[PDB]
Design a protein around this ligand. Structure first.
Ligand SMILES: [Ca+2]
Lengths: 314, 317
């Protein structure tokens, strides 16, 4: 049994080139070393009012994109959250072991889902005996609540849950017009999406901030440096060996980058469309993932219900 | 047939006031209504429980409702935790409930989130079954009204997915307050599973008045103690109260206490005979919980899948 890694994927989330070359490209190559779990959290998504048609479409978009990146439905467990009842069941039970004050510290006319979703996050992770969690900086507090709830529950009932640990990377990709590239960027021009057409990549790379050194030379030190990090990650080349290739101006660099990133995204995107348009295949993937997820999750939930004192479902 | 939903705490301490008033009445209407009795063990854990006692009290409650006459073939009786759709809809309805609506729910220390959020789960329990009517007490009126508001709010967004639900024994030593399981002095309370000799003793010590000479006459204002014993006697036996005023003309209070104790005791001995039979047959209780949970899930899943389709979730394949 390998270490279990759990990651949540927002249905509306837009994966950037930073998300891919930095983290997800490595995670794909390590699916034989870890039991990786990817949960498309549509129950977390409806804490914000959602257009139903866009929610359904975005869930399928996200599934197809992760499959396009190489997530293997048989090696890993990839599923839609609402297809696995155990998430809501454990979410309710852990409400009774979470303090109202803890949720208040997470930050009226908000809905109860926004207030309570940190408990559902804890259930998402603890269901699968998760060992490690890749947490963004924005999610640090949520992960520490999951640890505190797991320890509190185990102190009462015994070692039912594993106490999850945050996990660390690692290609560095910086925001183009402000050299870290983030999927949360309020400025779209700072990032390149995985579903970005070649023309828009060319336009964002050409417009990337750079330093007006005279004469313009290619050297790692913040604009020019970003393009060296991005190009090196795509081509697997050393930064200095790249500088050997560039006498050329910053326009040579920006052109070279844009061509490489678009070459890599094109291979990802054709896989994306082949999976995305095959709705029957996606239904099979969600069925396999949900059934595998529930089999694993029910082992933990039934031990939780046993310890709480519920009559076991006959 | 109209659908009626009632939640039963897994406590196993029904009082004779609860039975004669509420539960006994519903037992006779199982042919005219689709009655749903849900033993709400997920609500119970909003207060920390001893694990073994919770399990025992859930089976105690089931056996007790069975002995009172709830028929698992006419009605649907099940344990809440056996039907995952309750928690599933509970989470979804959180997103359509305002924080302030739960904050204004009066019914502390370091409260846990379940104690705050359980009114949402109550709404989920009711709405899963297209429920028409919920027989709540006065102290759960707010909870029912919140369930109605959430159903209306959801329907106003997505269309009519939910049905909107529709909008006397006293303490023996304190006959101006209704018989309460929470009473600190347990000699105020008669439970359905109270030993007959114990029930007769408490009835014998029930408060009365100081009329010289004693008079047995229904006047709640001046003779609360005697009027209470006449309501209990009228409830067990069905005799109209003026009949007992005529039967006790010239009789003393001790005669009436002997009459209430005997009648109450007889009712509790038939109920307890059935209870111990059901409760000692755990295989029978398991099969009732299995069947009840399958029926409950069959109806609940229809509503939950319609809710998920309106919200925009991908349908589970
Ligand atoms: Ca495979």
């Amino acid at each position: 049994t390998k270490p279990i890694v759990f990651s949540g994927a927002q249905p509306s989330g837009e994966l950037t080139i930073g998300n891919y070359m930095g983290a997800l490209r490595q995670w794909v190559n390590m699916q034989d070393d870890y039991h990786c779990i990817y949960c498309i959290v549509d129950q977390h998504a409806i804490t914000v009012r959602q257009d139903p048609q866009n929610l359904r479409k975005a869930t399928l978009d996200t599934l197809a994109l992760y499959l396009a990146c190489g997530i293997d439905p048989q090696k890993s467990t990839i599923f839609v959250q609402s297809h696995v009842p155990e998430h809501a069941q454990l979410g309710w039970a852990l409400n009774c072991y979470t303090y109202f004050g803890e949720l208040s510290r997470m930050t009226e006319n908000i809905n109860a889902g926004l207030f309570d979703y940190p408990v559902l996050m804890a259930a998402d992770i603890l269901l699968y005996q998760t060992n490690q969690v890749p947490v963004g900086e924005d999610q640090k507090q949520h992960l520490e609540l999951s640890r505190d709830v797991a320890q509190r529950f185990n102190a009462i009932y015994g070692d039912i849950f594993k106490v999850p640990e945050p996990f660390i990377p690692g290609a560095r990709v910086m925001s183009l017009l402000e050299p870290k590239m983030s999927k949360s960027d309020d400025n779209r021009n700072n990032v390149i999406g995985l579903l970005e057409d070649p023309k828009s990549v060319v336009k964002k790379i050409k417009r990337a901030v750079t330093d007006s050194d005279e004469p313009p030379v290619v050297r790692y030190d913040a604009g020019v440096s970003n393009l060296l990090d991005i190009l090196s990650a795509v081509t697997g080349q050393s930064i200095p060996e790249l500088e050997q290739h560039f006498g050329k101006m910053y326009g040579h660099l920006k052109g070279e980058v844009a061509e490489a990133v678009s070459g890599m995204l094109t291979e990802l995107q054709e896989r994306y469309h082949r999976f995305r348009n095959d709705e029957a295949f996606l239904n099979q993937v969600m069925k396999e993932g949900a059934e595998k997820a529930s089999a694993h999750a029910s082992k933990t939930l039934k031990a939780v219900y046993e310890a709480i004192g519920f009559v076991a479902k006959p």
